[PDB]
Amino acid sequence: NIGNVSMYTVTLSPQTKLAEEIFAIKVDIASHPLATTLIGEIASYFTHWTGSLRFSFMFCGTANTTLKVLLAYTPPGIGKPRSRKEAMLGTHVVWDVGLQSTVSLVVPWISASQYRFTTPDTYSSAGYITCWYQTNFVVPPNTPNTAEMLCFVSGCKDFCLRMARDTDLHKQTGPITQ
Amino acid sequence: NIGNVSMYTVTLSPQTKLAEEIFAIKVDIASHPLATTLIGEIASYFTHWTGSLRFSFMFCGTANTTLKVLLAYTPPGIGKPRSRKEAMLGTHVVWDVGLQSTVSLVVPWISASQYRFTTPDTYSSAGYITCWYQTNFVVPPNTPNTAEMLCFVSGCKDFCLRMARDTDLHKQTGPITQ
Amino acid sequence: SDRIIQITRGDSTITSQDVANAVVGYGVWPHYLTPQDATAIDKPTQPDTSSNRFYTLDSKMWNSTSKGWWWKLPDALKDMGIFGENMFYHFLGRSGYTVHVQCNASKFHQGTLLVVMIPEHQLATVNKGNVNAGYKYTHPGEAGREVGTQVENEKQPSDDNWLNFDGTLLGNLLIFPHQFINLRSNNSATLIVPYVNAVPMDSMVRHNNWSLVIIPVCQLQSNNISNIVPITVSISPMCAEFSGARAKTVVQ
Amino acid sequence: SDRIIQITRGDSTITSQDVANAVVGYGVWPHYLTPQDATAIDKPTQPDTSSNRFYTLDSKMWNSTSKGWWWKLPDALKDMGIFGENMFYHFLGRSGYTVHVQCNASKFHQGTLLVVMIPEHQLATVNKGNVNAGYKYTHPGEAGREVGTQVENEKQPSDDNWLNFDGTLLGNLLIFPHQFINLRSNNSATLIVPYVNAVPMDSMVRHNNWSLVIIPVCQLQSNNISNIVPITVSISPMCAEFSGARAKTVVQ
Amino acid sequence: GAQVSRQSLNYFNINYFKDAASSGASRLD
Amino acid sequence: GAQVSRQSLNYFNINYFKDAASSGASRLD
Amino acid sequence: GAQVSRQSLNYFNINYFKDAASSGASRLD
Amino acid sequence: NPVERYVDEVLNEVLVVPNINQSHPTTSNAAPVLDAAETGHTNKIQPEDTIETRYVQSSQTLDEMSVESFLGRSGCIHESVLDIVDNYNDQSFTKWNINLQEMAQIRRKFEMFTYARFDSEITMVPSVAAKDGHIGHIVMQYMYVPPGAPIPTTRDDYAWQSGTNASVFWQHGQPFPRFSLPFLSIASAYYMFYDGYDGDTYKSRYGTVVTNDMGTLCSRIVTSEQLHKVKVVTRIYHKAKHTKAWCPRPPRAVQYSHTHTTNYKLSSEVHNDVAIRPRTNLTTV
Amino acid sequence: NPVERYVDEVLNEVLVVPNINQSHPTTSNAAPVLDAAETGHTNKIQPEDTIETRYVQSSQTLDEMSVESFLGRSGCIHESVLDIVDNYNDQSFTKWNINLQEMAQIRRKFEMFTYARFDSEITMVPSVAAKDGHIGHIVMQYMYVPPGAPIPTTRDDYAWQSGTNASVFWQHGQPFPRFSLPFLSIASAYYMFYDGYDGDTYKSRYGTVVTNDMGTLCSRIVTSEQLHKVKVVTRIYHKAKHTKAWCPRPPRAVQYSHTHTTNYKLSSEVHNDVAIRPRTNLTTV
Ligand SMILES: CCCCCCCCCCCCCC(=O)O
Ligand SMILES: CCCCCCCCCCCCCC(=O)O
């Protein structure tokens, strides 16, 4: 998908098995795939971060396509949830698709220390955010059986970066000439 | 003409074709032929300039010689006018020769940026000033059929130079000895 | 000095050191249309300095046999910068003018030009029944018309200067805003005219409000005839405003 | 209702019964240049309603394989009525815009367009050394550019939508004034942008201040693909003013 | 220049050169 | 910063840099 | 010499040597 | 108080971040978590709205994230080389067309904005390499030649007289040279990007090269020819001061290839050209 | 206010330029554009009088165009050479008849006025070239010998005692020497030009050589003879301070040929001797 707009979309569709997993990524602001987002790029210019993160999702199926999804944040000290039941025991939002296309899940700052390192460090790995089918993707007849979802990220009022440093998300391997 | 006083005069005479072009030069204060004028020499000691320019012309034919001329300033973003009609669409002055020998055309500061480079630079080339016959050069019989015109330049109240630099209008290629 | 004049319009300034005062047509200075006299209800566009500036037409040559010249407004300015564009993109237009006619010679020359601004100069045809002057002939543009040259055609208008090209005597043209350019006295004429019409605004494409007529009433004479003596016309719209925007009208 | 919108500009009024609010670029509403920030000293011309009106561009067809489209301002309006005339008769121009992108489908359709207004969108070339995008390629006019069609040439700009045609990632275009046209939610996008530049006025012929980029981030899909789904763009200048009048510039 | 403040905690914001470009980093806000 | 005291024995506790980490050893108690 | 001004923005125009020729560039006007 | 503001500067607590307030369970028809990204606005929902938060006093400050701070660090922009190999007269002087386009690190930071206005602090780090053993007495001259001023063509060119141009003379053993430059543009701000040309033909130049002419830096070893050859490398560092920036933009995602242009190269496997790391699948963290 | 004037100095806004006011169309028998250059006066017409201008607030300042600024930049006026070749006693010292006539750049600027009064800041840049490898310990002595004082004829001449003359001793490795000199003339101002002689015969001298005697600068390497030969070049820089100038004049249009004289050389094709570039014709821009 890299090199294509499709790298930004997640496909949803009618499921035959219940509570299927849709996606899973680390919450760490400068880890992949969050790294190249604007907030991830800026975070990569600093050594420490703190605060809550705002993850938003916009459903892009037809207006007659319905769906309920469960977005969960799993605080650290445990592996990523292996099932919806395991995931919902943590922080989560049950999203019902309707007139309003977008939902937001806030990943609260839940840490032992006041700050965490922006670069991939065990001790300060913030946890995971997973997505699961709460009910199912449903459509009337004569309607596309798949739909896309867009994912956004930004920082809440308490977000903050500290200790300026050079980024490792960009390099120079030769002279830049005229 | 260089090396002769005639390099400072422009000849006028009875025309057989209407609206003939008399002269055309760039308005850029440090470009040629403006470069060696006093204001051009001083401008050559600075990197930037701004403000309006005052161009004056003194007719030197006999007191019985009449003439009407059109002096035009063509703001940039277009080539120099190829005809009087094309030129008069810009800023101009119709000069009628009479008891008062001199006329002045002001080249207003019409620029995108607050300043321009004094050295010949495309992006900040200020435009052109052209001269055309408005009617014709007319004289009674037994009167010289040609006459000279002198051209002057100076800066208006808003003229200003900036960023001192060494001039390229003078050089030293060897030791100056005793 | 009362012999001198400087007229500044937009980015243009015109001078003359030998004028004969100036004329303000019917004593009314041009002004924008007021809401009491307006009829069209859309907001007018007023180009201001980009249209209210001097536009110099093609010069003409005056010689011992010249019978005259005439131009019609706004037709003469149809191809003049922003003013011209506006008169074709809009259904309606309204404007006043400053007409400055230029002609210098020498003090040993003599000649007299009658410069007149005629409102509704409805031209006639001669010996052609009820056939009237064709559109093309009354819309010559900045080139205007040189009386006594045009090779006849059926829809061609009258070319009789003594009958004002309309069945009235030349001697009475003085009842219209006018001036004379008498070579021994002045080298220019200046006439400022207001908008004159029975409607507040009108089509600038099919209605010429004013006509500039220049007739040499006293033959150009001198003992140095080889020196060409041109006549140049510079016209500046005043308070130009347009209404009824749409695509650009293309004539012909 | 907050789903409805009516935008009136000059003699034009545009409506939409399914909008997603509107965006005002950087929170600044367009306004005329003040004397504190001005530099050019001649009096500006302000066409007002004859230039500050909606101009609708050529429509484009959106299909399952579309990679995107982009236009540059003021280039896209270079041939649009009075606004277009003014940008070529004057050296300097200044203007804000109201961009209204239109695209309706059906409730059984799905698709998402990312509509963005980028200031100084300096395009890149790919694998061509220091050779930059040629003037002609960044001045396509109202036709704009259809990403993924143009047959390559040396001075041809990048056509990589995921790299914003300039070496940056598509996902971050949201940092610029933007909206989305998500077929299940809205059938139009509205963006009002002010004049943005490091100088108060500039050449409208050689400097494109804003670029309108439309990328389908979610493929158009439905069970009635034979029905064509166009995308139409209507742009209205705001507070358009020009300075430095002269002859009309002719490009090429 | 010396922008002497008072509170005693006196603040001495000194500008050693006669050009604005010469001073150090700007204050925030 | 200059924390000027008075008693005359004037004390000039000067902080030459704009960061707390830059100052010398702390006072006791 | 110290030509101390007041406004608080205090100006300290100091002349380190005892000859006029030693001072820096002159003020304008 | 100019003294209370002083304390905040020393402690770096000028820009404080909001506290988190205690929240409670809710049951309402007002759903803050729901919105519409189509509007182009970011949902302003905060943690108190999605979970039951405790009260926490924030002590974090945004001072270090200020634009002044971000662009206020001195970075290398040029590495001038004067290598005496076999001809002192030709190799003892050089010139450089000044710009901030040749070094990726600082270029990328400034290019995160469309326009920027600032004064510049230039610091120079010269290092003399003794190729034959000794360095003798090295004295350097760095002259700023604004566009238009005569550029020296020999090491004894009259232009080195510097009768008007600013020149900095450095003596080996003395501290690193440094000077300030005021905002230099003929415009109100520097263009980090420029979607325009210097004309309207197929041969007109495109981009910032059109608007960003800063003149030339001419250098020379003042010392006359010495027996032992040296290689003097002067590294130029730039730091923005009293900074303002406008219209933020996406960070450079691929390597730079040339100055004053956004051009880039792409390989057959594009994932190698960007910092994005391929994921095994959607659910593999 | 001495504090408000201080702010203007820092911002360089002491001399502001006038604003442009809005103007309107006019029809009058008063024609400002018309005048008579024969009077010897410049028409004072401004843009508001020839076109319809808008109102614009000027922010430009003339500070940098002041005489103090124009002549207040340090430029090279001399390059003293002490080259040890084969005789230390003869080659380790030299002298120079002081003047500002030998370097074109600063000479031309000062010569744009007829008279000038100012104090001088002299800065010296010495550079020791190691011809044989080492430079040892170089100590220099620069002595100002006013006209009349004994001029040294050997490196150990008693005059080097400098019992009254001012001498500056520089040690290699220490910063560049610098000192100030007060306006030195026996008159009220320096003559940039002098249409006079030092007598009334065919053999009397003409020009500024008659009025501008500034004495001599005598230099020597204080260090006694060392094994390794060196070439010490001391470049002298001058900057005017607290300046006043009178009666501006045409700038030098051709190269200078000699000191204290306006003499010049002309080739067979004079357009090569001046900065004027031949035009194809009157209408070719
Ligand atoms: C002796 C070198 C002068 C040092 C460099 C000064 C740089 C300041 C100008 C910044 C303008 C940025 C635009 C660009 O990319 O060229
Ligand atoms: C050790 C050198 C003393 C440095 C030079 C001082 C120059 C000041 C005198 C200026 C008078 C100008 C007249 C001239 O051209 O000779």
From chain H, pick out residues whose CB is under 8 angstroms from the CB of A152. Answer: 37, 42
d(CA I50, CA I25): 9
Using a CB-CB distance cutoff of 8 angstroms, which residues of chain I are in contact with residue E20? 10-12
φ, ψ (nearest 5 deg) of residue D83: -60, -50
CA atoms within 13 A on the CB side of C49: 31
Contacts of D17 (CB under 8 A, 6+ apart): D3, D4, D187
Distances (CA, A) of D122 to A16, D125, H193, H205: 48, 10, 6, 12
H-helix segments, chain H = 4-11, 67-71, 88-91, 104-110
Ligand 2 in reach of I219 Cβ (< 6 A): no
| Contact assessment for residue H255 and residue A172, using Cβ atoms and an 8 Å cutoff | yes
Interface check for F6 against chain E (CB to CB < 8 A): the answer is: yes
Cα dist from D140 to C115, C186, D5, D136, D157, whole Å: 50, 55, 30, 7, 12
SS3 I108: helix
Amino acid found at D72: K
Protein residue with its CA nearest to atom 10 in ligand 1: H100
* I129 Cβ under 8 Å from any chain E Cβ: no
Q: By C-alpha distance, which of G27, H183, H77, H182 is closest to E22?
A: H182
Q: Of C167, C174, C156, give the one whose Cα is nearest residue C213.
A: C174
**SS3 label, residue H196:** strand
Q: How many CB atoms lie within 10 A of CB I224?
A: 10
**Which amino acid, one-letter code, is at G21?**
A
**Do H57 and H13 contact (CB within 8 A), yes or no?**
no
DSSP secondary structure string for all residues of I255-278:
---BTT-------SSGGGTSSPPP
Helix (H) or strand (E) holding I4: helix I4-11
Nearest CA in chain I to E20: I10
CA distance H240 to H245: 11
Q: Which ligand is nearest to the CA of I238?
A: 2
Q: How far apart are CA A95 and CA A72, in angstroms?
A: 11
Q: How far apart are CA B165 and CA B160, in angstroms?
A: 15
Residue D146, H or E segment: strand D145-146
Give A16→chain H minimum CA distance, Å: 18
* CB-CB under 8 Å, C98 with I27: yes
Map out the domains of chain C with their CATH numbers.
Answer: 1-252 (2.60.120.20)
CA angle C7, C13, C15 (to 5 degrees): 65
Instruction: Report the SS3 class of residue I50.
Output: coil
> Distance between CA atoms of D21 and D2, rounded to whole angstroms?
7
User: In the structure, how many helices (H) and strands (E) does chain H have?
Assistant: 4, 10
| CB-CB contact of B135 with B20 (8 Å) | no
Residues 6+ apart with CB under 8 A from H138: H126, H128, H171, H172, H221, H223, H230, H232
Torsion, CA I220, CA I226, CA I227, CA I231, rounded to 10: -30
CA proximity to C147, closest of C238, C229, C71: C71
The Cα–Cα gap between A66 and A61 comes to 8
Q: How far is B141 from chain I (nearest CA, A)?
A: 27
Q: How far apart are CA D239 and CA D48, in angstroms?
A: 7
Query: What span, in angstroms and rounded, lies between the C-alpha atoms of C189 and C204?
Result: 25
Both tokens assigned to I218: 């005598």
Question: How many angstroms separate the CA atoms of H7 and H17, rounded?
Answer: 18
- Neighbour-count burial for E1-29, b at 16+ CB within 10 Å, e otherwise: beebbeeebbbebebeeeebbbbebbebe
How would DSSP label each residue in B63-74?
A: TT-B-EEEEEEE
Residues of chain D positioned with their CB less than 8 A from the CB of A9: 217-218
Q: Kindly state the DSSP code that residue D207 receives in the 8-state scheme.
A: B
CA angle D207, D210, D211 (to 5 degrees): 110
Enumerate residues 79 to 138 of chain C having a beta carbon within 8 A of any beta carbon in chain D: 81-82, 85-86, 89-90
Q: Is A42 helix (H, G, I), strand (E, B) or coil?
A: helix
Four-residue CA torsion sign, A55, A60, A61, A62: positive
Determine the residue type at A95: W
Q: Is the CB of C12 less than 8 angstroms away from the CB of I51?
A: yes
Q: Which residues pair with D42 in a beta bridge?
A: I53
Residues facing C236 on adjacent strands: C98
The first and second tokens of residue D106, run together, are 């059906």
Q: What is the 3-state secondary structure (H, E, C) of chain C?
A: CCCCEEEEECCEEEEECCCCCCEEHHHCCCCCCCCCCCCCCCCCECCHHHCCCCEECCCEEECCCCCCEEEEECHHHCCCHHHHHHHHHEEEEEEEEEEEEECCCCCCCEEEEEEEEEECCCCCCCCCCCCCCCHHHHCCHHHCEECCCCCCCCCCCCCCHHHCCCCCCHHHHHHCCEEEEECCCCCEEEEEECCCCCCCCECCCCCCCEEEEEEEEEEEECCCCCCCEEEEEEEEEEEEEEEEECCCCCCC
Other Cβ atoms less than 10 A from the Cβ of A4: the count is 13
Strand partners, E13: E3
Token readout for C49 is 């300095």
Distance CA A133, CA A143 (A): 20
Give the C-alpha separation, H117 to H99, whole Å. Answer: 15
H or E stretch covering A125: none
A126 near A108, Cβ under 8 Å?
A: no
**CA distances for H63 relative to C76, H77, H117, I172, angstroms:** 67, 26, 19, 46
Neighbour tally for C17: CB within 10 Å: 22
Give dist(CA D93, CA D32) in Å, integer: 11
What is the rounded radius of gyration, in angstroms, for the C-alpha atoms of chain B?
Answer: 18
Contact A61, A147 (CB under 8 A): yes
Any atom of ligand 1 within 6 Å of the Cβ of H120: yes
Distance I120 CA to ligand 2 centre (A): 8
Which residues in chain D have Cβ-Cβ distances shorter than 8 Å to B109? 39-41
Query: In angstroms, what CA-CA distances link C90 with B79, C45, C109, C140, D77?
Result: 29, 10, 46, 21, 18
C-beta of H99 in contact with ligand 1 (< 6 A): yes
Q: Rounded to the nearest whole angstrom, what is the distance from the C-alpha of residue I237 to the centroid of ligand 2? A: 10
Look up residue C178 and give its amino acid: H
Measured between alpha carbons, how far is G17 from I119 in angstroms, rounded to an integer? Answer: 14
Measured between beta carbons, the chain B residues lying within 8 angstroms of C105 are 66, 138
CA atoms of H80 and H170, how far apart (whole Å)? 15
The sign of the torsion formed by the CA atoms of A84, A89, A91, A96 equals: positive
Query: Of the candidates I31, I259, I285, which has its C-beta nearest B24's C-beta?
Result: I285
Residues 6+ apart with CB under 8 A from I40: none
Three-class SS state of H171 = strand
Question: In the structure, do chain G and chain B come into contact, i.e. share 3 or more CB pairs under 8 Å?
Answer: no
Peptide bond into C74 cis (omega under 30): yes
Separation of alpha carbons I217 and I72, rounded Å: 22
Which residues are paired to D141 by β-bridges?
Answer: none
**Residue I78 Cβ < 6 Å to ligand 2:** no
Instruction: Give chains near G: 3+ CB pairs under 8 A.
Output: E, I
Q: How many CB pairs under 8 A join G and I?
A: 53
Distances (CA, A) of H43 to A14, D193, H27, H32, H53: 29, 21, 20, 8, 19
Which tokens belong to A10? 């997640």
Solved using: X-ray
Q: How far is the CA of I119 from the centre of ligand 2 (A)?
A: 10
- Which domains does chain B show, CATH number per domain? 1-178 (2.60.120.20)
Separation between Cα atoms, residue F11 and residue C39, nearest integer Å: 85
Question: H202 and chain B: CB distance < 8 Å anywhere?
Answer: no
Assess contact for A64 and A124: CB atoms under 8 A: no
Residue B33: is the preceding peptide bond cis (ω within 30°)?
yes
Quote the distance between the C-alpha of residue B93 and its chain's center: 13
How far apart are the C-alpha atoms of H99 and H26, rounded to whole Å?
A: 57
Q: Residue D18, class by beta-carbon neighbours within 10 Å (0-12 exposed, 13-18 middle, 19+ buried)? A: middle
Give the phi and the psi of residue C16 in degrees, each rounded to 5. Answer: -155, 135
Measured between alpha carbons, how far is H59 from H56 in angstroms, rounded to an integer?
A: 9
Per the structure block, which two tokens stand in for B66? 């009449």
Ligand 1 center to residue H266 CA distance, Å?
Answer: 29
Q: Which residues of C touch I27 (CB under 8 A)?
A: 5-8, 22, 98, 190, 192
- Ligand 1 close to Cβ of residue H181 (< 6 A): yes
Radius of gyration of chain H (CA): 26
- The amino acid sitting at D61 is M
Distances (CA, A) of C145 to C157, C177, I285: 10, 20, 36
- The candidate with the shortest Cα–Cα distance to B167, out of B119, B109, B116, B114, is B119
CATH class of the domain defined by H1-285: mainly beta
Instruction: Indicate the top mutation candidate among H190, H209, H259 to test ligand 1's pocket, ranked by most ligand atoms within 8 A of CB.
Output: H190
Could you tell me if the CB of H216 is within 6 A of ligand 1?
Answer: no
Tokens matching residue H153: 């063509």
Mutate to test the pocket of ligand 1, among H111, H112, H140, H238 (most ligand atoms within 8 A of CB): H238
Distance CA H154, CA D34 (A): 50
Distance CA I236, CA C112 (A): 76
Distance CA D106, CA D220 (A): 11
Cα-to-chain-centroid distance, residue C94: 15
- Please tell me the distance from the alpha carbon of residue D41 to that of residue D244, in angstroms, as a whole number: 9
I239, I74 contact by CB (below 8 A): yes
| CA–CA gap between residue D36 and residue I57 (Å, rounded) | 5
Atom of ligand 1 nearest to the CA of H217: 1
